[PDB]
Ligand binder design. Structure first.
Ligand SMILES: */C=C/C1=C(C)C(=O)N/C1=C\C1=NC(=C\c2[nH]c(/C=C3/NC(=O)C(C=C)=C3C)c(C)c2CCC(=O)O)/C(CCC(=O)O)=C1C
Length: 491
């Protein structure tokens, strides 16, 4: 079934227990405390040297040099806003300050992650004109480009990419900003398997993820197995959680040495990431984490506003076309001209590269459409049996093997009937998605992991396929198809 944390290979890593890592990155320390009463019962092995403490494991938090207990207590107030929560405390014998991050896993007590504090700095001069740029963005393109720039300006990382996941989970490098001279990944695709489902749920549970040095030596928890459960400690909510050797090897092959990844979550779904990559090990100021979180919420809000604006654009193009015909039939005794271009493109309310109208044995086409004999082959298949108000597919060959030769122009077809005579259709097209990008290639083993190979593994799945048809896509064909039909019954 599911391989334990350090132990997967390329064939079973989907199910690797990355949330049960059993270890942390060396630049912090992790205590596990029981409740109530707050006895340290599990600790990262580096805890004593890291925190300047004699012993750790088994000693009550009250008895640890320096105010940590006192600093967590106000956040266990039933009525407080509570966990996850950050605190600043002093710990240890040569006493020093730490930023603590406390949360409660569903099982195992209280987890407290510690890192060395620096002096307090105020980053709020950053989020305000950034907030204005985000809320001001005119399009998804513009917003993601500005978000790559913005994240590069406030993080200083060598490369920032904003990925965007599609219906199936696959990633597109949708925006990129990098220091001149690096190679570009802008426009690359990767298969959804490059990011395991559990990694995806982890990006929803915490919104900032940090790797300071791709070369670190994991520091194990002791005892490892939680004494309260006899099982591995749920580490979903741990900022210091080690990172899978699989992905570390991926970064090593890419040249990359550090990583600051921020989650974009839209309507409760992981929508993409803002990935910051550095070609050097890289520490960050604690106050940079809240900045990322605030920024990613603004972005996610804007994306919602854009998708929603796009929505009513469609619903407009529609009820603003019942009229492109109403009259444009008064003089010029036929409606078709309204269908085809006129810059009210029948092609974009569905994001298609081609459209055809088959009506009374007359076939007209804009964009990239199969041969007119080929439209007829499709019309012949639509008439083979009774259909829904809309019929669609994003893998025409394979769904309909005899139509395989149409993969090029028409892996994706959506058809809507326009009467009952039938043989009469409004038909939209999309090419095999391979033709929406090109570049790629190669083989398999952790040493072979790379963007190049990922772009190739992507072309391989996806093979007999177009961009999938969305709900909105189908709603549009639905309602467009309908109002044409309504108005053909007219005359
Ligand atoms: C079977 C397991 C894995 C295979 C195979 C794999 O490629 N990755 C697997 C596990 C993990 N991936 C994690 C994060 C991650 N992986 C990549 C993959 C990309 N593919 C691309 O072509 C490129 C470059 C353009 C990349 C970066 C991406 C994009 C991500 C998101 C993180 C990032 O951008 O740095 C992952 C989680 C790591 C963690 O612990 O935070 C696991 C596990």
């Amino acid at each position: 079934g599911s391989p334990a944390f350090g132990t997967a290979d390329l064939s079973n890593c989907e199910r690797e227990e990355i949330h049960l890592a059993g270890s942390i990155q060396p630049h912090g320390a992790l205590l596990v405390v029981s409740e109530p009463d707050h006895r340290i019962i599990q600790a990262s092995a580096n805890a004593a040297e890291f925190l300047n403490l004699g012993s750790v494991l088994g000693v009550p938090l009250a008895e640890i040099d320096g105010d940590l207990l006192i600093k967590i207590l106000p956040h266990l107030d039933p009525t407080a806003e509570g966990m996850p929560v950050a605190v600043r405390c002093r710990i240890g014998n040569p006493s020093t300050e730490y930023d603590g991050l406390m949360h409660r896993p569903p099982e195992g007590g209280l987890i407290i992650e510690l890192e060395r504090a620096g002096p307090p700095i105020d980053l709020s001069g950053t989020l305000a004109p950034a907030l204005e740029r985000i809320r001001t963005a005119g399009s998804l393109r513009a917003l993601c480009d500005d978000t790559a720039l913005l994240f590069q300006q406030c993080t200083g990382y060598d490369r920032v990419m904003v990925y965007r996941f599609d219906e199936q989970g696959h990633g597109e490098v949708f925006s990129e900003r990098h220091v001149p001279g690096l190679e570009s990944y802008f426009g690359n695709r990767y298969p959804s398997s490059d990011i395991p489902q559990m990694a995806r749920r982890l990006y929803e549970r915490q919104r900032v993820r940090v790797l300071v040095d791709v070369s670190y030596q994991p520091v194990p928890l002791e005892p490892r197995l939680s004494p309260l459960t006899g099982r591995d400690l749920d580490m979903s909510g741990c900022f210091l959680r080690s990172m899978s050797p699989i992905h570390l090897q991926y970064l090593k092959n890419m040249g990359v040495r550090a990583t600051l990844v921020v989650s974009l979550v839209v309507g409760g779904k992981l929508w993409g990431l803002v990935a910051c990559h550095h070609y050097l090990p890289r520490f960050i100021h604690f106050e940079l984490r809240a900045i990322c979180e605030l920024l990613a919420e603004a972005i996610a809000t804007r994306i919602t506003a854009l998708e929603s604006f796009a929505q009513s654009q469609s619903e407009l193009f529609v009820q603003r076309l019942e009229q492109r015909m109403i009259e444009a039939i008064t003089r010029e005794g036929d409606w078709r001209a309204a269908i085809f271009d006129t810059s009210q493109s029948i092609l974009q309310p569905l994001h298609a590269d081609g459209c055809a109208l088959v009506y009374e044995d007359q076939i007209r086409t804009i964009g990239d459409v199969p041969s007119t004999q080929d439209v007829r082959e499709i019309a012949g298949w639509l008439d083979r049996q009774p259909r829904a108000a809309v019929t669609s597919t994003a893998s025409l060959g394979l769904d309909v093997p005899e139509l395989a030769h149409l993969t090029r122009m028409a892996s994706g077809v959506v058809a809507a009937p326009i009467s009952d005579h039938r043989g009469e259709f409004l038909m939209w097209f999309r090419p095999e998605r391979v033709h929406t990008v090109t570049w790629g290639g190669m083989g398999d083993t952790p040493a072979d992991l790379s963007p190049r190979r990922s772009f190739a593994k992507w072309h391989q799945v996806v093979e007999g396929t177009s961009d999938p048809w969305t709900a909105a896509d189908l709603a549009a064909a639905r309602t467009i198809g309908q109002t044409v039909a309504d108005i053909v019954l007219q005359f």
